[PDB]
């Protein structure tokens, strides 16, 4: 997209600071979830200024890199939508249950995702997207072969590319995939979002099918939640030991989370470091912990 100039990021910081003016209303009573929204934009400003410090000798060469253009354009768009969200919401920002508040927390999740992506691509303010390490080789082979040194791609190229290895049945499904694989919500798949996805749904050989069972037709799957929201969900089935869910954490991308209820009535969690998600799910089915997904008696087969 558009070439990067320093004045526009001056504008951008004014917007982030203005969103900070909006959100710092205590009447919102924001919880540090996270995503806190408030804390992420100071860290975004700070890390961006770190990139600038690193690129003081060659500002123009940084402005002609695709990733910085796409990322900045998207940050300006999302923060403008964050202002116009309060604009539309008006007073209904004072209660969390209201819809504009939910949209605010949605954009908080997004902001957390974008910062995470920027820190992944820019460690110490330096571009290493071209030398980005994809975790599962099979995924790294696919990415080096289909695109190569590319850091970011348009979603259309990724749909047409991934479709050749793992076919996509319909636009109904392709939209659902573009949901997860594009965490930034900017029609651009990066090596960061791709690597997170592949680590989340190993192995590669049945990647798309791994996506289907573990995400689409699964009841226990809860996408992104915080420990507060998880306990709020399982409080309704606390008396029922073995009722479990599994979710994702913004704090940790590309890592799984599993929550389940014990006979004591305490809600204890587990994380699958070893074994993939499905295998660990099966094993917990054999042990006697993962019995009811979301307090539902029918348990899917893996």
């Amino acid at each position: 997209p558009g070439t990067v100039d320093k004045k526009m990021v001056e504008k951008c910081w004014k917007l982030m600071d203005k969103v900070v003016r909006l959100c710092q209303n205590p009447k919102l009573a924001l919880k540090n979830s996270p995503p806190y929204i408030l804390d992420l934009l100071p860290d975004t400003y700070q890390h961006l200024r770190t990139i600038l410090s690193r690129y003081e000798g060659k500002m123009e060469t940084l402005g002609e890199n695709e990733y910085f253009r796409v990322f900045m354009e998207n940050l300006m768009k999302k923060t403008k939508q964050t202002i116009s969200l309060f604009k539309e919401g008006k007073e209904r920002m004072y209660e969390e249950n209201s819809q504009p508040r939910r949209n605010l927390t949605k954009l908080s999740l997004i902001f957390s995702h974008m910062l995470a992506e920027l820190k992944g691509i820019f460690p110490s303010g330096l571009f290493q997207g071209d030398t980005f390490r994809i975790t599962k080789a099979d995924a790294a082979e696919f990415w080096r072969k289909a695109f190569g040194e590319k850091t970011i791609v348009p979603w259309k190229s990724f749909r047409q590319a991934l479709h050749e290895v793992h076919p996509i049945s319909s636009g109904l499904e392709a939209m659902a995939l573009k949901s997860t694989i594009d965490l930034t919500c900017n029609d651009y798949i990066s090596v960061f979002e791709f690597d997170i996805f592949t680590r989340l749904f190993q192995p590669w050989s049945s990647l798309l099918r791994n996506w289907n069972s573990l995400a689409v037709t699964h009841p226990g799957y809860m996408a992104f939640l915080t420990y507060d929201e998880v306990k709020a969900r399982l409080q309704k089935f606390i008396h029922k030991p073995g009722s479990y869910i599994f979710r994702l954490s913004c704090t940790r991308l590309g890592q799984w989370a599993i929550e389940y209820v014990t006979a004591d009535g305490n809600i204890l969690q587990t994380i699958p470091h070893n074994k993939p998600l499905f295998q660990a799910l099966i094993d917990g089915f054999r042990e006697g912990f993962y019995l009811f997904p979301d307090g539902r008696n029918q348990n899917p087969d893996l």
Partner: protein, 87 residues
């Protein structure tokens, strides 16, 4: 599952459908409208999760259509809801 789906504004060709926001979050809503008993592949479009209302234009006047609505979280398709309207 979007709750309490209904059409609230009607023209021969354009319909305003309003469903209530689910308690759970919605990243995006997916809508597929198609001719009742029509072999033609249904038309489809998407809206952001903030909206509770959507408008369809270009529907032929004098047809009963079947409209299906999906809620979408990240890698998640909640169960849909459907309505049929005669224009």
């Amino acid at each position: 599952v979007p709750t309490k789906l209904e059409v609230v504004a009607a023209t021969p060709t354009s319909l305003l459908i309003s469903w209530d926001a689910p308690a759970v979050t919605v990243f995006y809503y997916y809508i597929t409208y198609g001719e009742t008993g029509g072999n033609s592949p249904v038309q489809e479009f998407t809206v952001p999760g903030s909206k509770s209302t959507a408008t369809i234009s270009g529907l032929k006047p004098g047809v009963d259509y079947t409209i299906t609505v999906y809620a979408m979280y990240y890698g998640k398709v909640y169960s849909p809801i459907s309505i049929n309207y005669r224009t």
